[PDB]
Every structure is written in structure tokens, then in C-alpha cells.
From a paper:
Respiratory chains are crucial for cellular energy conversion and consist of multi‐subunit complexes that can assemble into supercomplexes. Together with the ATP synthase (CV), these complexes form the oxidative phosphorylation (OXPHOS) system, in which electron transfer to molecular oxygen is coupled with the formation of an electrochemical gradient over the inner mitochondrial membrane to drive ATP synthesis.
To this end, we improved the resolution of our previous SC structure (Rathore et al, 2019). This yielded a CIII2/CIV density map with an overall resolution of 3.17 Å, and, more importantly, after particle subtraction of CIII2, the CIV density was solved to an overall resolution of 3.41 Å. Particles from a dataset previously acquired (Rathore et al, 2019) were re‐processed using an updated version of the software cryoSPARC (Punjani et al, 2017). Using the particle subtraction tool and local refinement tool to subtract the signal from CIII2 and refine CIV alone, we could generate a 3.41 Å density map (GSFSC = 0.143; B‐factor: −125.9; Fig EV1B), which was used to model the atoms of CIV. Additional improvement of the CIV subunits was built using the 3.41 Å (FSC = 0.143) density map. A Ribbon diagram of CIV with Cox12, Cox13, and Cox26 annotated.
Author numbering:
A (entry chain a): 5 to 534
B (entry chain i): 2 to 53
C (entry chain f): 47 to 145
D (entry chain d): 30 to 146
E (entry chain b): 16 to 251
F (entry chain k): 16 to 129
G (entry chain g): 3 to 57
H (entry chain j): 6 to 83
Amino acid sequence: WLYSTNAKDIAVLYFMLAIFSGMAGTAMSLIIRLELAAPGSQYLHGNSQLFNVLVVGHAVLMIFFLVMPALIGGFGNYLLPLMIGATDTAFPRINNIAFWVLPMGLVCLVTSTLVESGAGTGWTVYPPLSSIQAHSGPSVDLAIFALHLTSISSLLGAINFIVTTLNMRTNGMTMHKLPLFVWSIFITAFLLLLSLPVLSAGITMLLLDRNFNTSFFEVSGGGDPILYEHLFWFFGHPEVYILIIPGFGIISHVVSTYSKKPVFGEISMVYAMASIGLLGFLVWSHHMYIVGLDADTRAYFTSATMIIAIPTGIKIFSWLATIHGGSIRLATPMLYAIAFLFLFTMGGLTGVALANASLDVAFHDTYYVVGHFHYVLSMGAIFSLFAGYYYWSPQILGLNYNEKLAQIQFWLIFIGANVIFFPMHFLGINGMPRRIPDYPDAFAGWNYVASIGSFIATLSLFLFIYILYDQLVNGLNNKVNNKSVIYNKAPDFVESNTIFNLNTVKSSSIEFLLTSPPAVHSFNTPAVQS
Amino acid sequence: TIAPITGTIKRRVIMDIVLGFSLGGVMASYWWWGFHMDKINKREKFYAELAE
Amino acid sequence: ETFEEFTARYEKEFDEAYDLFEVQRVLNNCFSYDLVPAPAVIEKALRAARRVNDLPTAIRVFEALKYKVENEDQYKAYLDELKDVRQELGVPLKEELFP
Amino acid sequence: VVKTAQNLAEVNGPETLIGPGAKEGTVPTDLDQETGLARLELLGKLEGIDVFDTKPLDSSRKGTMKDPIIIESYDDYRYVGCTGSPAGSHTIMWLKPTVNEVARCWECGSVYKLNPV
Amino acid sequence: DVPTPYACYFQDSATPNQEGILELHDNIMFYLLVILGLVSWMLYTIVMTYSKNPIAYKYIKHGQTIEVIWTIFPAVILLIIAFPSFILLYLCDEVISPAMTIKAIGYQWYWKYEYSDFINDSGETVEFESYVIPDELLEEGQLRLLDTDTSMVVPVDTHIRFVVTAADVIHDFAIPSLGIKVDATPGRLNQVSALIQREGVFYGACSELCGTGHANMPIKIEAVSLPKFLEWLNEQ
Amino acid sequence: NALKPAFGPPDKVAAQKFKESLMATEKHAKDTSNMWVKISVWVALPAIALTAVNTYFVEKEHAEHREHLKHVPDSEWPRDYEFMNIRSKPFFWGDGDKTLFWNPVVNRHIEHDD
Amino acid sequence: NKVIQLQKIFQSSTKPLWWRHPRSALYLYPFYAIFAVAVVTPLLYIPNAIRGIKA
Amino acid sequence: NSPLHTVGFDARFPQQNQTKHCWQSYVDYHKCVNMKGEDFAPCKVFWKTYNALCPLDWIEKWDDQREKGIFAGDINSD
Amino acid sequence: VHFKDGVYENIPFKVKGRKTPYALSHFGFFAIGFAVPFVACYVQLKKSGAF
Amino acid sequence: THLERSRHQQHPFHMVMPSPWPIVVSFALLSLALSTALTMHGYIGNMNMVYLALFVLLTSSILWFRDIVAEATYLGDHTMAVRKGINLGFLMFVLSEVLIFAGLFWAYFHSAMSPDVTLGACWPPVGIEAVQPTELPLLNTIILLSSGATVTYSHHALIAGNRNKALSGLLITFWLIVIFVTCQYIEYTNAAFTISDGVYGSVFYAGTGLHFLHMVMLAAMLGVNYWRMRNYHLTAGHHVGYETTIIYTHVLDVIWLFLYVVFYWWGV
Amino acid sequence: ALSNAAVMDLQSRWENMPSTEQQDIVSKLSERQKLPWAQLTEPEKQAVWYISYGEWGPRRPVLNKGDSSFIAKGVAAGLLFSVGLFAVVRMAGGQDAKTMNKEWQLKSDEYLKSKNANPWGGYSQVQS
Amino acid sequence: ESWVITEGRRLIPEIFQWSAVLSVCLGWPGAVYFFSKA
Ligand code: HEA
Ligand code: HEA
Ligand code: CUA
Ligand SMILES: [Cu+2]
Ligand SMILES: [Zn+2]
């Protein structure tokens, strides 16, 4: 419905924007890797603009319009009232404006590309390239009004999430007895509250330099452009952990469900997940190790970036101990979660070498960084986004999803996306710079190998669309015959099959005990816990 | 009289971490003693000639 | 916490079962611990199937005893210690049934 | 003649929760200018009884099928979390004890009869 | 130096301040293989030998003696890694005794070097600009997008201090073989120090984005011998 | 009848404890109204009316200093620095209007190309 | 003053809430006029400004 | 037999950013030649410093700022 | 969707009972989201003279 | 009992009715963002489309507040658990409003602790005549300091039970947030350095320019509380539209006391 | 008692048994187990094990018998279609690089070997 | 007198299957280089 205030109809409007914009985030990802398959400007004619335009069109659409409105918006607004037993969210109307300002932020981005210049600044919109002396058009003004409309989407959803799980939980649910996915959006809604004013100041200080020539960062005037480097990345690394703490929430539940065991040391899992967000503020200069910082400052930021391996490493070793003792039911959400423990591990170790200030001088703005963050974004924040769909969509929509067709969609993602991003470390370790339209002739090797895998990942997205179509049409027929899997938890070894049908769902959370799909007033009387 | 049988999985993580360090340890000994000492031997053989 | 304190915790729970649900539940978290129990525990589990009159929940005892035994000879020593209780009741092994 | 409540026992729905008139030249004293939902909880706070239930459930006994645990509701799907018999025994497990069908707590063993109201 | 097609490693070293980076990166990845060995072996014993286990050991939650172990054990690994890192970070900015100063200013699509120390016989600061030779004006044998026309030369076995800045948008000064990278912010000017151990050409690239032609400016550095250096310097 | 006994037992002691905590709501708001009314009219307002005319004592001479500036035309203006008038993308609401508001007496923007 | 009478109107009317006051016909009928003007004229200037024709 | 020679450490500016090492040496050269140039040798030591590590578009910039009397830093000690 | 909860009712689509095939309005929604960069690839290249 | 008790809610939380204000505000921000980034590069000719798009955003937000005032005293679903939510929901909004000034405090300290080479070694740069703190900016403080000392008896006399005392303390508080707007408008016209005079005219006219913009929002928030107290809305025990504004009043008398000690006393 | 023709081979007969008989044979069975065991019929003793712990409904595997051979027959027909879809757009594309075609690389080494570029490793540069 | 072999019967095909799947999951760029050196 159009101006509805129901807190779970907004969450499906969120999810009709992720897969829309994630398609355009992939089609812009297609053209970039198609142009980079061979030396010489093949498909683009000679234009290096429209390549630096389709990089910021691809990085904004995938971060601010795919992973953020689906992890924080999609699975946030649907499951944060449900798993705490709230009837709706706390402020229901500003939950609606947190959605509808995103398609207006979608219009302000596509109209930033059609205007004659095109934002050729990269995702980090650096000041003297995006000052009015270089980009004279109104293109990048619309490209930061899109980041203004997205910032007030994620801010006004984060205020709604803090004050939901602080007083709208049910009777016996204290803060210690909370689900891990509720704690994960509760930590994340504090970082969105404590980093977006730093972005929305630093973006506005860039808008005032162009249209009002106030010289916040213009050099003729003493405006140092390293201030924007400090100001953007104080948002930028908290923004990085905001896309991955809900990634840690869903994996903490798919593992605990498809392996019939509780999470190993749950109260020590929440401490490690909260000490990422507190430690995430104390590092931002590891994106600018080589701008000219003094040696004692580089010695600090190489230590405080190494400390983040401690609480993240606790969470990986806790997930290994959870699936160890118990049974394992290898359905397709468990396949996405069991590959999250490997691909986020290899993308976390690559950041450890990058965290050294004395080693980053041979790695900054090479493809060793681009091969690093895709192993924790296109495999950390997307695998958990795919796992979050296949674990809950028979409950949300009410229709099963043709399980044996979903197995090959995972397998074409895992062997598909690994063909792109694994040779990307080889281009950066040899010296290929970042954001180049075409490369020197000695880089035609792995740029051809990493271009075949772009079509394996894109065909996987097209196979996901047919699964998304086969779940809707004849989705009811998939739970009356032997296509899909119905019960996520098979009975125990001494459970009778006629006694399993009395007590079916052995869930440790509310959202599987509701009707499928849940009603519009799912709690007209409060639930009680222990 | 059946003797009391216990601890069948406590012996399956002590004998699994040990075979996890000794399976990456002889994966990392090839890197530093068989690959890093391959390139650094080619360096100080080549730089031995450029004093002559 | 102990092993003899594990027996006299489950020698009681199979003496208050009254129902099929409270036998298959108590048998479920009798094998879901670390150790496999002594046969003094598993004797009550067979006896508590006659309290509720259900045969295949007394067959899965000897099917779960085979999996959680850690050594093939010990499966032949649990069966040999259960000389009479398998024979007085009459529940057979699953392999002898060959289903 | 809708006749506002002035006590909890006489409500008869939202027609009689209007409250009396406001005096001129003074503040509203919060008893004469309420509306009908915060008016109802104000009448509860003027008595001892709290209107909205905030109580964790009975977690002192286990309860067999001969002697279950009753959970007073206003519908037929009051969700129950039964983390243990001293309320710290096992992990949580959520149940939906509906009318004429109890829930049975596959881990712990408690029985929950609805008593729907 | 020259990148190789289908390569997987660094380029060949030319600087002891880059020779330490190769010693640091191999010492770091020596410890990132034990951890990847431990993770990927635990993720195959658990997946194989517990997808068939029907009875789930659902009564182990705390593990007190193993949570303390994986708290200090990443703390021991990162403390071992830091001491090669803290030595190399300090000992890469020893600018105590240089011998020649080179400036390098990037004019948004091309570089401009100037050896402004009056050390030659003419009496002026020698300066020139270096553009990439275009695709029309190529000659058969050049390295495309890597080989410019009028390169920068330096002596060997002598300490040289670069001074890198710009008078336009921010863009980087990067050579992978010497291991130097300073982003050249136009309000300021950074400096690096790196002597070259062996003569020969080194190629580099510009890594920070500057606009349209971000790729079309390499930094050709051909270190020559010192009596051959002063022949070029007194001439040009 | 069926399904209709009552609602809940009267606690009957929270009342005359919650209402007894609400009788002190007025009793505490009487003194803290009296504590702040004396400081806002006999402490803070003596600081207002004493220094507002002190501030209006320098207004009559600093506007006179503004009257000094346009008294002489002074085409020999001090030739302001490189940063004093940034004009990349000149302003869109006005012709050569520097800000949203500026008096012309002290914001002349005299161009000296020479 | 006028609050208890407005309690009798806004409760038990079954109209949309923003319409419920009697003094609302001359609020939204001008507001829906000047909102439909101010939302299309930014969109109408879009395809001319893409080509590059300004004032 | 050691021809090449330039500016040493100058420990008051030890870090990587040398944007004021160019500047402070430039002012101290123009402070010397105005305020009691004792000879042209013992304050052209500054002239050897700022001719290095200062771009030749920066030197003509401050030469214009001191030409029109609009230079930022104080060079007139008198 | 504020009333009439059901299996196909909580979605702003209209899956069953459609006058047209649904796969028109499903794949014709994502191809709009997939060909929206190519129209930005078109009109920016066409503005730059080349075709 | 159980018949009349079943004719109400069971949870204290308020379920709002669907209303088309969060969509119309969303079509007012798009028509603002499009009309702004067009008119700054020509493309329109006059400043009329911004003057209407900013006007329709102001009207479509004052009609959102027309619903919440009716939802709180004409239907009145703000219970004890809802009022804790609004008081805590605003308290998270004011945290971002405080931290948005940390971006304009970092900008000053990055431009004053390490002084620049393009301007002089000093701070403020040479030629720019800075604002003296022993003048009218001190009058901007003592007016604002007493404003936080005259709204806090207008709140206490509201609970005490007299309108004429609590209304007099709000009228002379609303004038203090329009004297401070006026005396920071007079100073913004009798200064000597513009928005485009380097950085000292830039970081100064954004850390105080944004604070001047919030005082218009505080004087409007102090305006509806005078309208509601005259029209008999705020009770003696239920006022969340007033306890919200006292938080906004004291927090703006905190960040001004950082603006005064940094941009005036520490600057000169 | 109960007929031997009723529960004989209750492995394939339980699926596609009608629903009103499927819950009828257990009601005939569950009355009979109130007796001392090893008096039951030997195919009847098998048949109660398929009801309580069989592979039907619940305890069905996540993948059937013909799924692991179907998963590998959809992945390898997705690789050998994506690379087939790779060559089609690789055909309809721009002109190749000028310097890539193998004639530069025979003598760009002579530029490199004259200057001693890569002393270890390799400067071979020959990719066609 | 038994327990070393009953783990040794399982772990010895485990450490061989693991290196078989790790050398494909990590060493697969060694295959594309070996064929087409061109
Ligand atoms: C959100 C994070 C994210 C994700 C997922 C991706 C995904 C991908 N990215 Fe991107 N990328 C960035 C963030 C991301 N990227 C950033 C920040 C930059 C840097 C910009 C700059 O340098 O400034 C960048 C830059 C970047 C470059 C530029 C390198 C250079 O600068 O020259 C390249 C080129 O190779 C690239 C490729 C890819 C590819 C092939 C994918 C593939 O993984 C895409 C295919 C994967 C999918 C098929 C799955 C997702 C699709 C869905 C719709 C999800 C559906 C699931 C649910 C909703 C249930 N990316
Ligand atoms: C969103 C996902 C995400 C996540 C989770 C991370 C996590 C980390 N990132 Fe990364 N990173 C990005 C995405 C992400 N990053 C992006 C988008 C960029 C910038 C690109 C651009 O500039 O446009 C970036 C940039 C970036 C840089 C800047 C390089 C450059 O641009 O010059 C650095 C360097 O310090 C870095 C490091 C790290 C580290 C140390 C972690 C750590 O948190 C990781 C912790 C994980 C582990 C360490 C593995 C688990 C641990 C073990 C198995 C057990 C413990 C073992 C030992 C201690 C050895 N990241
Ligand atoms: Cu200069 Cu990129
Ligand atoms: Cu980072
Ligand atoms: Zn229980």
C-alpha cells in the first residue's frame, strides 16, 4: 500500500528496492568488468568519463541502495518488531519516511548521470576533483543530494530502531535474553546515529565549496583537502562495519538453527559484536596511511586496526564451535552460512596485511584493496543477504522456493564470484592501480580471468530472479509435493514421526512460531517469556 | 561389568586443533622455508656478482 | 558433573514418565550429552517403554547405542551385558529385523 | 449523558472516557483533560491495579499434562517462552498453546493449557 | 620495473626500503597461512564428519578454558607481527643524510620534475615535463601506457629525497619497485627517501584518481651510473 | 457467566503511594518555581539591562566608524589578499553579490587587475 | 477551552484524521493545488537540462 | 670527488610533511636580506634551502605576493 | 495492506487472478532495473559525439 | 471485568493510522533537491522554484505536526510507555544534532592548530579583522544564558497550577530567542569578512551559521508551546511537547558556550 | 489379530496408501502393542518401525535420490553457458589492442634486456 | 589398546580430502596459467 504505516509492509517495500537497485548495481558492475576484459577501449569508445561515472554509480547503488536498505531496512523493519514481540515499530510514520526518501534518492542519482558531466570522482568524492574548478557541471551536486536523501533514510530508521528495542520488548524479555539478530541491529543503529552527522557535515562542506565558493577545501584560501579525507573516513569505516554487523546477526541464527545447537557462548558473542562498533570509531586513518601523516600517528593506527582482529576472531571461532558438536542439515541457507565462514576469513586476513602502515605504502589504491573488500562485501554482506532470504522467505511470503534449484544458485555464486575477486589480489600485488579505464599491457592476464567470472555471477543473479519468480507463482504447489524442504529442523534420533507432528517447530526465536504469513496485527495480546 | 565410558568428544577437539596447526604449519613452512628462501636466495646470489 | 551422578539423575527420570512424549524426550537428552551411559541407565529406558507400550522407541535405543559407542567391540559388550532385558521384553535389534 | 468514568469499574467502551470540562483561567490537572486511552491507564494508576500486564510467566514448577500451566489471554495464540523450570535450566523455546491443544516443551517438558478468556 | 603478464608477486626490488617490505609481507603471510590452515581444516572436519551425526551435542555452551585460549592466541599472533612492522615503519623515513633533492609536481594529466639544486655547470634549475606518448605517435617497441617520452633519471648508490606535490587536483606518485607512494595534496608537499641499489629503468603509475585521464601518466625512472649522470645533467 | 469473572485484584496500596508521590509533584514545583523566579528577574535581568546599554554604547561609535569608512570614497582600498574574495562559480541569486547579506560600506570588493 | 468539544469530534467520526477538523476544507484544497504545481515543474525542467539548454 | 650535496635533516621539521620547511626558509631568506644583510654569503644558506624543495610555480607565486605588498607572512622585521 | 491478510495478499503485486501473464510484470520489472544503466550508457555517449 | 476490558487494547503502545504525510514530505524533498541542484547552475533563471519547494516542505511538515497534536489530546494514545518512547526518541535525534557540530569543531581545529602556508602563520590570517569577544557576542551569551534560566521556571510553574505565571515566563522566553536571532543578524551584517574570505570566514560562518539556523527552529518550537498553553492543551502532568523543547533549549545553551569559548575567545 | 496381507512390505505401500486407511492401520496396531512382545507378527514388527521412524514426510532428506546428480548437471550447464555467453559479447565488441599482437613483445624484451629490467623473476612480456 | 586406530581410520582420508579441496579452492589460478601462456 502507498502511504501505509504498517511496520512490516514497509519492510517488503524495502525489499522491492534492493533487488531493483541491486540489478542496476550489477549492470553497472557488468560494464566495468566488460571494458576491463582486454586492453584498449572496447565497448566504451574512447570515453574515460562514463567509466569514472559508472564506478560511483556502481558503488553507491550497491552500498547505499542494496546492502543498507535490505540488511537494515528489509530484515530490520520486519524482524525487529517480531523477534522482540512488538506489535509494530516505535515511531511508525517516520518508519515510512525512512523508506520513501530512498526512491527520491534513487531519482536524484540517475539524474546525476544523465546530466552532461557525470560524477567522475569515485565513491569517495574527493574535494579538488569534485570542486567546481574540475567538475563544472551540476552532476555531482545531485550525486550528493542522493547521499543526503540516503543519510536521512538511514538516520531516521536508526532512531526508530534504538527506541524500539529499548521499551517495546515484551514482558519477560530483558536485554540479556535478547536474540542475536536483535542485538546486531541494536549495535548497528548506534553507529548510524554516531557517524552520519559526520558525513552530512562533510558532504555539506563540499556543497558549499562549489555553489557558494566558501573554500572549506579549496587550496586558494588555505582549505586543506586532507580535512575531507579525515571527515569522510570518520564516517567511512563505521559505514563499513554497519554493512557487516547485521551480516554477523543472520549467520549467528542460520548456524544455530540448521545445526541443532545454541550459539557457543552467546553472552560472549554479544560483547565481541559490540566491541567492533566501539573500536570502529578509533580507526579511520588506515584508509589514508600515505597522505603524509607523521610516523607516531601511523604507529597508532596500525595498532588500533590490528586490535579489530581480536573480537572478530572471537566471533569466527565461536561459529566454528557451534556447528562442531551438533547435527548439520545442509539446506541452502546453511550452504551460504558455511561459505561465509571461509570467504569472510580470507577477506579478513587480507585486511590484516593491509592494516600495517608500513605495508600499505605498497598496497594503497591498488587492486589488492579491491580484491580485499569484495571478499567481505560481495561475499560477506551478500552471502548473509542471500542466507537471510532463504532462511525466512517461506515464513514471510508463505511459499517455498524450490530448494534443489536454489542449490545451484549458491554453487554458481561461490565458484562464480571467486573467479573475479581471487586474481584481483594478483593485479594489486604486481602494481595495477585503482580506477583505471584501461591498464598497461602486462595486466591482460588476470583481467581476462576475472572477467569470465562476472558472467557466472550475473547468470546466478538471473537464476535467482527465476527462483524469485518460481517462489511466487506455484509456490503453494512446492509444499504439497517433493520439490522443496518444508521443515528446517528435522526431528531427533528418537523422535517419532507421529509425535513430531504435534510439536513441529523447535525454534529459539518468535518469528517461526507465527502464522505464515503473519497477520497485520500479529500481537493483539502480549507474549510472555519464561 | 562395563567400564565407565566417557569423554568421546573431548579427545576429538584436542586431536583436531593439533591437526589444524600441523596442517597449516606444514602449509606455511613451504612458504617461508621453500618459497621466501627461494626468492631471497636469488637476490643475494645476483647481488653477489655486482661487486665483481 | 560426575558420571555416577549422571546415572541417578536418569534412573529417576525414567521412573516418572507416564507418557510417550516424556519418554522420547528423556531418551533424547540422555544421549545428547557427552558420554554414552552405563547399562544401568539404559536398562530403565527399555523398561520405561513397557510403561508406555511402544515398541519402536525401544528399537531406537539399540539403534542409537550403535552410533554413540565409539568402538565396535563396546557395542558387543553392551549387548552382552543386556542378556535378559532384551530377551524378557522381546525387543529385537534393528539389524536382526533387517527392515 | 455519556457520563465520564471517574473510576475503573464504569467504562463501557470509548464513549464514556471523555472526561469532564476544562475550567477557564487555569491549567488542566490531567484528570479532567484526558481522551480515552491514556485516560484508561490513568484510572488504573489512580487505583492500584496496572492495566497492561507486564509479568514473566510461572517458572517455578514444571507441570505435567495432568496439572498444566494456565496462561490467561484475550485471543487464542499467546506465545510462551519457557527457558526452564527454575527459569535458568535450558535455552529458550517458543510455544503457541492454542485452544483445545496444549504445547509440550520438547526440551524441558512443561505443559501449557490456554484458558482463553 | 616492468610488470609481467600472469604474475602473482611483487615486482623486482630496487631499494632497501622496498626490500624490507618484501621481508615484512612474507613474514606476515607466514602467519596468515597457519590461521587459514586452521580455519579451512576445521571447516572440513566439521562439515564432513558432522553432517552425518544425528544426535546433536546440544549441552555444551560455555567452554571456559577454550574462550580464554582464543582470546590471548590472536593477541600473541598480532604482537609477533607488530615488531617487524614497527621496525620497518620507523626505518623507512630515515631522511638524515640525502645527497640530491628532486621535486615532482603533477599538473593533472602529466608530471613535471625539477632537480633544482645548483650542482651543475650551467646555473639554472633543470626542469622538464613528461607526457605519455599517444597511441597514434607510438613506435613499435614501446610499452603502451607505461613508457613516456622524456623520463626522469637519477644516480645509483646515492640517497635521493623526493618532494612530491601538485598545483591541481589530488593525484598520487607511485612506483612499485622502489616502494614509494605519496598522494601529493596541493596544499602541502610530502617527502620520501629511497636510494636505488641497481641501475635500470623503473616504471610506476599514478594511483589516485584525478579526472578523465587518470591512467595516462606514468613515472619513468631510469637510474643511471654517476659519471653517466653528470653527462646528462650538464648537457640538459 | 462464562469467560467473565473480573479483571484483576486491587493492589490498593500503590494508590496513596503513587498519589502520595503526586502530591509532592506540586509541592516540589512550588519551591523550584520560587527558586528560579528570583534569579531570572533579580539576578539575570540585572545582568541584561546593565550590559545591553553598555553594548548600545559601542553601537553609536562603531556605526560612526562605518560612517567614517564611506566618508572618504577611498579608491586606495588596501588591495585585499589572494583568499579574500573567492569567486569560482560566481553567485546565482545576484550579479556580483558576495553573500546573502552585506552592507557595501565594509564589503566593497574592489578589483585591482592592474 | 475548545479541547473537549474537539475530543467529541475527533473521536467517533470514522473520517481520515487529517480531514476530521471542520477547518480543514480550506487547508488541504489549497495545499493539494500548490503541491501538484511544485512537484512537476522540477520534473519538467529535467529533459531540457539534460540536453544543455539554460536561461 | 663527491659532487652531489643538498639540505640535511633540519630536525625542527622531522616528519613527512614539509610544507612549512619550504616556507620558513623562504621568509628567513627575505628577512636576512632586508633586516641587516651582513653579507650575501651567510644568509644565502637559506637560499640554498628554499631553492630546493619548493616548486618553481610556488616561488613565482610568493614573488608576486611580495611584489604587490599582499604577501601573507611578515617579512618586514623593521 | 491493512486488511484481509492472506498468502498472496501481503505483497503489493497481484500474482494470481491477473488479466495478463504475471511473468510480464515480474521480468519486466527487473529488466527495467537492469537496462537503466544502458540508457545512461546511451545518452551520455550520444552526448559525447560517438555512437 | 472481561467484556469492557476486551473492548480496548492489551498493550500500551500506540498503533497510528496510515496518513499520507511521510510520502508528501518525501515528494517535497525530491522537489527541493531537484530544484536546488538545477537553479545553482543556471537552468531556471530565478530563485522562485526553491522559494516554493522550500515553502511546500514547510507546510507539509506543519501538517504532520497538525496530526500529532490531534493524536495526543483529541484521541490521546500517548500512554506512559509511549511518552517514554517520544522523550527517548527525541533524545537520540539531539545526539546527532550535537555530533553534527563536531564536524564543524573538527574543521576549526584542523584549520587553527596546524596553521596554513597559503595564509599567514597566525590565526586569524593577516588582514581579516576578527570579532571581539568583549562586545555584542557577550550580549549574545547573557541573553541566551538567561533564556535557559527563564524557560525553567515557565516549566515549573506549569506543573504548579497557574497559567498566568507560566505564560509570562514563556512570552519573555520567546522574545529572548528572537532578540538573539536579531542580535546575531546585526552582527552578521556589521562584520568585515564574508563567507568567501578564505577559511576564517568559512569555518566561522558555518559553526555559527548552523547554530543561528537552529535558533529559528527553537523559537518556532517555543511558539507552539505558547499557542498550546493559551488554548488549554498542556496539562500539569502530561506535556511531552514542552519537555522536548527544554532539552533543545539547554543543549543549545551548551554548544553556544563552546562556540563562544572557541570561535571568539580562543580565536583572537 | 491382524491380517498378514495388510502390513506385508510396509515400505512402498505406506506412500500412496489412502489417508483414511493410513491412520487406520496404526489404530489397529496401537491396540495390539498392549501385550507382551515377541508375540507380534514378524512383518508386523517391521511395519511399526516404518511408521514411527521412517523416511516419509518428516525425516525426508533435504535432497532426494535424484538431486545430487541434478545439481552437478545444472552447475556445469551454467558454466558452459556463461562462457558461451561470454564469447558472444566478446565477439560483438571493439577492436583489439594494437600492441598486444605478439610482434611488439619479441623486441620489447630487447629494450628491457638492454636496460636489465628484471634480473630475477622474468621480464618476458610475451602474451599474445 | 584400540583408540589410536579408530581415529586414524577416519582422519587419514580427512587430511587427504581436505588438501584435495584446498588446492582447488586456492591453487586454481595455477591451472589457467599453465595452459595459456600463449
Ligand atoms: C556493497 C558492496 C559491493 C558489492 C556487493 C560489489 C559487488 C561487485 N563489485 Fe564492486 N565495488 C564496491 C562495492 C561493492 N561491489 C566499492 C565500494 C567499490 C569502489 C568504488 C571506487 O573505487 O570508488 C567497488 C568497485 C568495483 C570495481 C572497481 C575497481 C577499480 O577501482 O578499478 C570493480 C571492478 O572490478 C567492481 C566489481 C564488482 C563485482 C564484479 C561485483 C559482483 O560481486 C557483483 C555480482 C554479485 C551479485 C550477483 C550478488 C548481488 C546481487 C543482488 C541483487 C543481491 C540479491 C540478494 C538479496 C537481496 C537476497 N567493484
Ligand atoms: C564492509 C566490509 C568490510 C569489513 C568487515 C572490513 C574489515 C576490515 N578491513 Fe577493510 N575495507 C572495506 C571493507 C571492509 N573491511 C572497504 C569498502 C574498504 C575501502 C575501499 C575504498 O577505500 O574504497 C576497506 C579498506 C580497508 C583498508 C584501507 C586500504 C587502502 O585503501 O589503502 C584497510 C587497511 O587497513 C582495511 C582493513 C580491514 C581490517 C583489518 C578489517 C578487519 O575488521 C577484519 C577482521 C577479520 C579478520 C582478521 C579475520 C577473522 C580472524 C581470524 C580467523 C582469527 C584471528 C586471526 C589472527 C589475528 C591472525 N580495510
Ligand atoms: Cu594525476 Cu591520476
Ligand atoms: Cu576501513
Ligand atoms: Zn521448556
